[PDB]
UniProtKB/Swiss-Prot annotation:
The modification Threonine amide is found at residue 59. This is Kunitz-type conkunitzin-S1. Belongs to the venom Kunitz-type family. GO terms for molecular function: potassium channel regulator activity; serine-type endopeptidase inhibitor activity; toxin activity. Expressed by the venom duct. GO terms for cellular component: extracellular space. Blocks specifically voltage-activated potassium channels (Kv) of the Shaker family (IC(50)=1.33 nM). Coiled coil: none annotated. It comes from Conus striatus. Contains 2 disulfide bonds instead of 3, as for all Kunitz domain proteins. A double Cys-mutant carrying an additional Cys bridge does not show difference in activity with the natural peptide. However, there are some differences in the kinetics of binding of both peptides to the channel. It is found in: Secreted. Its main location: secreted. Residues 6-56 form the BPTI/Kunitz inhibitor domain.
Amino acid sequence: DRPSLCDLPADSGSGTKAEKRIYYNSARKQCLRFDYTGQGGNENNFRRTYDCARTCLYT
């Protein structure tokens, strides 16, 4: 099975920018794009789709 961070929601955070990041959506079982503000947020936040896939889909 997958680590508990995979269950966290997408969190845009508290910062002043916008950049593309990837999160694992538990309800869809997919790694999807979100808007990250550059600060704050949670560990379900990947710069590379591949890293979300290895962490939350399957090793």
